[PDB]
């Protein structure tokens, strides 16, 4: 399902920030979402961001209290199964092309090692 992200944006000094303007824009023609489709969200009091993010490939931009340009934090990619209750940081670290590929490599090596261990154990029992 379309996952929901929820966290509390915190400045480096333990003070939340209420007036954050987050922009999510997709850039893949994906089910029920279009290329270069933009959308905004403003965090409520306490500096807490919560929204259901439709899935696909979405780059995320920050604007703090007052900012000329928009800071680019990264580009998440959300699929059908992906942890529902998640902060945005663990979304971006765990979903980005470099991180996605490197996670895939990690997983493939893990699976290969598991397979070899299982095969060796089967040989030992046989």
């Amino acid at each position: 399902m379309s996952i929901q992200v929820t966290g509390i944006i915190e400045g480096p000094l333990g003070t939340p920030s209420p007036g954050i303007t987050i922009r999510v824009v997709s850039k893949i023609s994906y089910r029920n979402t279009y290329r270069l489709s933009t959308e905004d969200y403003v965090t409520t009091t306490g500096g807490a961001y919560d929204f259901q993010l439709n899935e696909g490939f979405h780059k995320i931009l920050i604007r703090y209290r007052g900012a000329s340009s928009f800071t680019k934090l990264g580009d998440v990619s959300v699929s059908d199964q992906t942890p529902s209750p998640i902060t945005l940081i663990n979304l971006l670290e765990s979903s980005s092309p470099k991180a996605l590929v490197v996670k895939l490599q990690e997983l493939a090596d893990e699976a290969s090692e598991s397979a070899q261990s299982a095969s060796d154990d089967a040989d030992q029992v046989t």
Partner: protein, 114 residues
């Protein structure tokens, strides 16, 4: 108070797409994600686009854009039908409120998403 040519840039504006490439490689195999944004700009011709001579003749249109938004070299700008690499004669009056660049049409087709 630093002068700000920004207001002197709005009238001449035009919609345009600003993309950048962040190449990704594994085992030395090239893939390229894209980042595209709709940005304000203004376009004039930069070097009157000529026809060079080679084994085969070739020509690349030159445009030189201004915008209030920052534009790094390794970025392309599409305005009509072919993106332009932001390569040459660029200058950043960022503290003065805008920046400019020449442009090189990459005769490759436009980088939609890859």
């Amino acid at each position: 108070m630093l002068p700000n040519m920004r207001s002197a840039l709005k009238m001449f504006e035009q919609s345009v797409l600003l993309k950048s490439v962040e190449t990704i490689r594994v085992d030395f195999v090239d893939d390229i994600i894209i980042t595209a944004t709709p940005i304000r700009a203004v376009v004039q011709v930069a070097d009157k686009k000529k026809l060079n001579l080679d084994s085969l003749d070739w020509s690349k249109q030159y445009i030189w854009v201004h915008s209030g938004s920052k534009m790094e070299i390794g970025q392309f700008i599409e305005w009509h039908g072919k993106d332009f690499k932001l390569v040459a004669a660029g200058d950043d009056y960022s503290d003065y409120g805008y920046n400019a660049w020449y442009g090189e049409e990459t005769l490759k087709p436009v980088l939609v998403s890859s």
